[PDB]
Symmetry: C2
Amino acid sequence: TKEKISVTVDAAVLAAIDADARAAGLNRSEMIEQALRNEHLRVALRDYTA
Amino acid sequence: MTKEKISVTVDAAVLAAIDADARAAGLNRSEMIEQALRNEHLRVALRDYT
């Protein structure tokens, strides 16, 4: 199951992600999905302190 | 800087997870997705440079 959604993003960021898509043989939606899947992991990263 | 409004098609489970992360972070969907894209672009740049 996949959802079609609308989002507003920085145009420069979008161009970069389009290029990363091309390098990987992906279309824009697939590359964005990869980014979202990975960001879900990244937000769980932690910094110990004091 | 300019922002662009786009439509993307993504896995429903992936979207739910990032929406959950957005709520935790007090961001809206677009802000969190842009964060995901910024971080993924740097990830790919480092990956392909090494």
